[model samples]
Every structure is written in structure tokens, then in C-alpha cells.
Target chain A: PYSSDTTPCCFAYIARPLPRAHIKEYFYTSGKCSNPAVVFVTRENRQVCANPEKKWVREYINSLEM
Target chain B: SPYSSDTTPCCFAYIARPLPRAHIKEYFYTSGKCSNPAVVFVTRENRQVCANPEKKWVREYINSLEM
Candidate 1:
């Protein structure tokens, strides 16, 4: 029943790396968009999207461990 | 703790009202953890609330933020 671009997912992604200290949590994007991504939520409560397949993204998620 | 796992970052329930843009800081789509998907809105206060993504106003509201 959900429409396009309405889910808590990324419509697009940015490759820029963010400081780990600001990242409170991370989650995978879901819903209509075929592009899958890892969304990092900053301590400021903002989201930054990264390609899930990248090694840096995976390592960062592992280090988060929270 | 809510987001320890990828699937844990989901919304099982949702609020009916369409929140004002001023109250909202940003929003993200839910993952496959829930039976119903949600538009998770983070208010300026940093509280997370769930909303029905199917509603026209909801869709429109989300669209406005992207620009």
C-alpha cells in the first residue's frame, strides 16, 4: 500500500565519508527503490547514505557494534 | 538499541496525523522488519515517529523535503 519514495530509505546515495563519532546508528534502506544503501544517522539526527556494497561502509557498520 | 540490527530499525505502528514540516527535521524509509512499511520522521527534538506512506498528504509531504 505504500507509494513511491515514501519509505524510510534513500532515493539516492552520497559517497562522502562522515566521522564515526557523529553516527548514532545505521540501517539498510528498503521499499520501492532498487538501489540498496546503508543509511547512517548522525548524532545530530541527520541521515547520510552510502553504498552498502562498499568495504568502507561495511567496516564502519562493524565498528559501530551498537 | 533500536537499531542494533538492520531489521530492528522498523516501525510496527504509525500516527495518523500529517506532521507539520517545521516540526520535522528529516525522514527515512523503513526496512523489511515490519509487516507494514513506514515513513519514519525525526522531529527537531530528535524523536522518531511513524506515518503511513500510502496517504497522499504523506507522499506529498515527503516529496517536499527532498527539494
Candidate 2:
């Protein structure tokens, strides 16, 4: 079934910093997409796409509770 | 709860058995947020299972299916 891959999430990303406190969690989309990205879930359950290559982005991912 | 784009990657990730080709309908790849990279397969039962993308068997599976 072509339920969601055609419209894979986190197709794009943001380099802008998201305060770590606001991030509930994040998940990485594989390179199979047109542009692989990281999707972050906010405390309020909001979703945001993040640039996986950015230095701070890497910092945030590493700093968060694993 | 229904799976949305936000939850699919984390929820579906698991060690998939090296099942027969006919048991799977299709496969897709996933990567780069909080977790690791993987080849997620859709079974004949319409369920998804995640497997290590670089693992030899899955690599062969992808090649066999040309996925």
C-alpha cells in the first residue's frame, strides 16, 4: 500500500535552533526520501523538521535524553 | 492510536526476521532523526517491520526485490 512514502515526513529541514526544552522527542527519516530529515516533536505535540547536518542540530540530538 | 508521520519511524523499528520474499509485499528505507537507519518491510499481512539496512541479508533482500 502506498499509504505514506509518496509523502514521506521530514522531506525538508530547518537549521534554526529549537530550544531543547520544547522538544519532546525526534525521529530520523532514512536517506530514501528525496531529502532525509529529522522530525522533532514539541512538548505540545507540534512537529518540526530539522536539519540533521547542522552543528547545533547535532548537539540537540546528542544532548537530549536518549 | 493511528500512526502519523511523526510516530511511524520510532514505532515500526524492530528486528525483522529473514522471512521468505513472498511473505513481504514491499519495502522502504528510513533514516536520520533520533534513531538509526533501516529498511522497513511491509509484510503480506499489511504490517510493517524494520530491519537493519546494512545487514547482509536485508541488503540481499533489497537487491533481490530491486527495492
Candidate 3:
């Protein structure tokens, strides 16, 4: 459960990382919100950062208002 | 290797603090196994939370049951 302005923002922990080395976390905001709406392939996109020893973070932005 | 609880429990952690918050701490699991599986996040959801894959500390926990 994420603290959202309206939509139900959810996140997951995957088992992989993106190619880019410097771009650890890539945030992709939606047209609706100024803040980050979605996240791209990066280091922060993991369900459990520890689960995948060496991986990245990726968020799937949805429109389920909170 | 999580301790099996009969089924993969449907668990999710709610971010209570407002966004733009720079840090989220790791879940030490201080609580004695709450009713609903709670997870810690933010600064890092899984930062040294538990050595699950290692299983050394976990072995001690499981061994306590036998003793």
C-alpha cells in the first residue's frame, strides 16, 4: 500500500536489473501527476532488493486511486 | 527460503508517510509475527532484512524449536 494523492499506487520487487549503470532508478511520471507516476527499469524496481542479489527497480504505474 | 506458512500469504506494505520522503527503513521483523505479514520499505525494502538465502541465522531460529 502506497501513500497516494488519489490513485492506488502499487509497487513490486522483481529479480532483475536494467542495462544502464549510472541510471540506478528511473522514474516515469504520468501525464496526470507532476510527481513520478511510473518507474522505469532501474535498481529500485526490485520487490526485495536483497532477493535478487544484484538487480534493479522497476515500477508499474496504475490508476487505482487511493 | 521463507518459513512456509501453508500458503503464500497475500501481504503488502502501506507507505504511511507522504511521498518525496527520502528514506524507508528495512524490516527487522521486530514484532513476534504479526497476524498479517508486514513488510518494511523505502530507504530500502530489503536491506539486510533477513539472511533468508544464507539461512545461518534462520537455522538458529529453527533449531530453537527443536531445543
Candidate 4:
């Protein structure tokens, strides 16, 4: 489901879960600078980052999925 | 008594044990938009600045009982 990821910034995410591999793979293909993706997992994982910067944003991003 | 003091954006913690004794601590006392107080656990550990208010959002439930 597409929930709101509002956090006083661009993009929004709710308490949801998605595969880490799937996120990384998608970023690898799309390339960064597309407004960034905010992921919120049930584990309280909140990640916010773009594509190209995914490399550095791994820790932040994975924190959401994992 | 309810644990309302332990809300998000609060820099207070009363855990059973003392936190790790790390020298290189980054106390965000008044840095940026991070208003909540938290015991950031860094150093290969899960470092998090918990939302003080968000942590204990169930205060209203407990408050109702007082009245």
C-alpha cells in the first residue's frame, strides 16, 4: 500500500516492509537523483536517500528494510 | 504512575543499567531540528535518538485514569 512518508521533507514512508535486495537492485538500475525514496518498515526502519548516492546511503536505507 | 517523562524528543533515560562509557560521544543537545532527547548508542551498536514524545504516546490513556 502507498502510505504517506511525510517527515518535513520530500517523499514519505510508513511502517512497512520491503526486500533489501529489491531496493538495492532497483536503485542500481535507476540511478540516483530521482527525489529519493523513504522506506519505513515495521521494525521502525526509516531510510531516506536517492539512487546514485545509494552506495553511501546503504546503511541508512538498509536500516529501513532490515 | 505513568512514564510520561520518557517521551520522544527527551534527553532523559532511566534504564536499569548505565549506558556504555564511550568517550567519543556526540550529544545533540541542541543541534539542528532534532529536538527530542535520546541516548545515542553508537560504536558498532544501535545508535538512535528516539523521539521522546513519540516514545510514550500512550500518556493520554494513563492520564484519563488520574481524573
Give the top-scoring candidate (DockQ).
Answer: 2
**Each model's lDDT:** 0.69, 0.64, 0.28, 0.29
lDDT of each residue in B1-67, candidate 3, tens digit only: 1322111112223334322223334223322322322332224443322223124443343343342
**Candidate 2 docking DockQ:** 0.05
Ranking the candidates on lDDT from highest down gives 1, 2, 4, 3
Task: Report the first chain's TM-score for all candidates.
Answer: 0.78, 0.73, 0.22, 0.22
Question: After superposing candidate 4, which stretches have Cα over 4 Å from the reference?
Answer: A1-46, A49-66, B1-14, B29-36, B39-41, B44-46, B49-67
DockQ of candidate 1 (2 decimals): 0.04
- How accurate locally is residue B1 in candidate 4, as Cα lDDT from 0 to 100? 8
Which of candidates 1 and 4 reaches a greater TM-score?
1
Candidate scoring better on TM-score of 1 and 2:
1
Segments of candidate 1 deviating more than 4 angstroms: A1-5, B1-67
Q: Write the per-residue lDDT of candidate 4 for residues B1-67, one digit (tens) a residue.
A: 0121111122223233323435223322312222333333222243433222233432322232232
| CAPRI level of candidate 2 | incorrect
Model 1 native-contact share = 0.00
User: How accurate locally is residue B44 in candidate 1, as Cα lDDT from 0 to 100?
Assistant: 84
RMSD of 2: 10.3
Q: What's the lDDT for candidate 3?
A: 0.28
lDDT accuracy of residue B55 in candidate 4: 33
C-alpha lDDT (0 to 100) for residue A28 of candidate 2: 72
